[PDB]
Amino acid sequence: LSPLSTHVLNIAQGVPGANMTIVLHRLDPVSSAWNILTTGITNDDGRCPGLITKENFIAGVYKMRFETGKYWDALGETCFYPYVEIVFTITNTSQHYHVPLLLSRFSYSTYRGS
Amino acid sequence: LSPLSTHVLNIAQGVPGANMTIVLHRLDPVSSAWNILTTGITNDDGRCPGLITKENFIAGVYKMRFETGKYWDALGETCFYPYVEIVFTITNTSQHYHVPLLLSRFSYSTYRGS
Amino acid sequence: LSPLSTHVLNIAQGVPGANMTIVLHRLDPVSSAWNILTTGITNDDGRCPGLITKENFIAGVYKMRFETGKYWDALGETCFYPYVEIVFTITNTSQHYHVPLLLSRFSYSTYRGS
Amino acid sequence: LSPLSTHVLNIAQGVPGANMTIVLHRLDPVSSAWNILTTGITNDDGRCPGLITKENFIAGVYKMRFETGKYWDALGETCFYPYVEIVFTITNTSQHYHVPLLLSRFSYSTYRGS
């Protein structure tokens, strides 16, 4: 299983944030440009298994971009945030990191889990 | 008064997020480059007056960057998030937009206020 | 001005939580009795001025009850929480305490403000 | 497994809220009495298995009380909230209900999960 996980929750409607596109990036330590690692689409439970392998999960700065505008558009409603990018520092690669997103049309929140 | 306002709250300590650098950008819709509009620092109450003028507040996509790593570093602690960017769409410029940040070392939240 | 303030934000719609009933209680330190101090109704800005006088703001355990179920029902929608009570300790009676509620139908959050 | 689950997260330190006392109550349909159903303590993952049996999970109003002040006191710190109660309505007894607590010394939040 992936050492990096997520969970998207639609807190306006009280259901998982299903079928949301998420793109995972890692900061290039040489040039400070962003490199794309992979993309995923959350399942029915708002989760996105297999984002990265233990082998590729090296220390660095990572970015998860949630396509929140597109998600809401597919539910027939507008979102204040066209997308959400969460940028976080990974230093100890043996810990598990859970990076969730609690979302409404006009709010969001996240926290570090394990 | 600026039609765009913020408020940074340190929810780990229950005090305002004072002396945090905030940078406001707007997307260039012809290119797709972000250009800096204003750089501010939050005051004792965690607020940042004068982010934009009414004249300069036009429809578009805006980004508020909060220098969360630098803020926490100055209090002698680390943050999971090196910075936080909140990206939002503005279509109606006759409304006030309040874009706060509630912050701990390991979580953050925002919402659209008036 | 009241040393205790609040602010209710409907984070599902990005608007103030107007016309919500809020009841303030203080714990009777001898019995297990909550005494009702004041009842209020949030204004168009989602606020409720005059919750308590400085003279009446003594050390103790306070409770603010927000009628969330009634609020949503008047909006024609259900809420997971029939009401919300926030219980808090006042020790230093010379500071300002702001005790807001950020609400959707399926979530809420609060924090200590000034 | 219990059809009601919880998860306490210490979002100040980015760790699970382990060893926190949790008491589950249900409102009496006839009297207005709250009755204790289960008392538990969170495990090292901040979770509390066995809150209720499937047979005992009937429609009604439930209340989860989290002993937040005692949690922080064991850690040598004060909390603004001496305890937190979340009151919620169970209408559909076939669903799973997850009722977490995201907590700092001066904030908390919850949402309805499944």
CATH number of the structural domain spanning residue D76: 2.60.40.180
- The token pair at A82 is 């066209």
Does the distance separating the beta carbons of A12 and C12 come in below 8 Å?
Answer: yes
Residue the block writes with tokens 């909006």: C75
Element (H, E) at B109: strand B107-111
- For residue D106, list chain B residues with Cβ-Cβ distance below 8 A: 11-14
- For residue B86, list chain A residues with Cβ-Cβ distance below 8 A: 81
How far lies B53's CA from each of A36, A80, B28, B40, in Å?
36, 21, 18, 14
Assess contact for A81 and B87: CB atoms under 8 A: yes
How far lies D25's CA from each of A68, C82, D82, in Å?
37, 15, 18
Assess contact for D30 and D2: CB atoms under 8 A: no
Residues B81, A86: Cα–Cα separation, whole Å: 8
Q: In a 3-state reduction of DSSP, which class is residue B34?
A: strand
DSSP-derived secondary structure for chain A: --SEE--EEETTTTEE-TT-EEEEEEE-TTT--EEEEEEEE--TTS----S--TTT--SEEEEEEE-HHHHHHTTT---S-S-EEEEEEE--TTS-EE--EEE-SSEEEEE-B-
Please name the residue of chain D whose CA is at the shortest distance from the CA of residue C114. Answer: D106
DSSP-derived secondary structure for C63-103: EEEE-HHHHHHHTT---S-S-EEEEEEE--TTS-EE--EEE
Does the distance separating the beta carbons of B112 and A109 come in below 8 Å?
Answer: no
Give every CB contact of residue D97 below 8 A, 6+ residues apart in sequence.
D3, D4, D5, D88, D90, D112, D113, D114
- For residue D89, list chain C residues with Cβ-Cβ distance below 8 A: 80-82
Assess contact for C98 and C6: CB atoms under 8 A: yes
Partners of C9 in beta bridges: C16, C102
Element (H, E) at B56: none
Assess contact for A50 and A2: CB atoms under 8 A: yes
Residues C91, B17: Cα–Cα separation, whole Å: 22
Residues D108, B105: Cα–Cα separation, whole Å: 15
Query: Which residue type is seen at B81?
Result: Y
Does the distance separating the beta carbons of A80 and B85 come in below 8 Å?
Answer: no
Largest distance between two CA atoms of chain B: 43
How far lies A12's CA from each of A71, C9, C75, in Å?
13, 13, 14
Give every CB contact of residue B11 below 8 A, 6+ residues apart in sequence.
B102, B103, B104, B107, C111, C112, D104, D106, D107
Residues D95, D114: Cα–Cα separation, whole Å: 7
Please indicate if the annotation marks B108 as binding a ligand.
no
Q: Is D50 exposed, middle or buried (0-12, 13-18, 19+ CB in 10 A)?
A: exposed
The CA dihedral of A38, D11, A69, A37, to the nearest 10 degrees, is -10
Assess contact for A62 and A4: CB atoms under 8 A: yes
Number of alpha helices (DSSP H) and beta strands (DSSP E) in chain C: 1, 10
User: What is the DSSP-derived secondary structure letter of residue C56?
Assistant: G
Residues A56, A89: Cα–Cα separation, whole Å: 15
- The token pair at C80 is 């997971």
Sort strands A21-27 and B97-98 into parallel, antiparallel or unpaired.
Answer: unpaired
Smallest CA-to-CA distance from D108 within D58, D51, D48, D68 is with D68
Q: How many CB atoms lie within 10 A of CB A27?
A: 17
Please indicate if the annotation marks B65 as binding a ligand.
no
Assess contact for B28 and B79: CB atoms under 8 A: no
Please name the residue of chain C whose CA is at the shortest distance from the CA of residue A10. Answer: C106
Does the distance separating the beta carbons of B14 and D12 come in below 8 Å?
Answer: no
Q: What angle do CA D93, D95, D100 make, to 5 degrees?
A: 110
Does the distance separating the beta carbons of B110 and A109 come in below 8 Å?
Answer: yes
Q: Give the range of the structural domain holding residue A65, as residue numbers without chain letter.
A: 1-114
B55/chain A closest Cα distance in angstroms: 22
Q: How many CB atoms lie within 10 A of CB B91?
A: 8
Residues C85, A79: Cα–Cα separation, whole Å: 30
Residue the block writes with tokens 């926290």: A111
Question: Across the interface, which of C13, C106, C109 has its CB nearest the CB of A14?
Answer: C106
Give every CB contact of residue A39 below 8 A, 6+ residues apart in sequence.
A21, A22, A23, A24
Domain count, chain A: 1
Partners of D60 in beta bridges: D90
List the resolution, Å: 1.7
Residues D39, D21: Cα–Cα separation, whole Å: 7
Smallest CA-to-CA distance from D21 within D46, D2, D3 is with D46
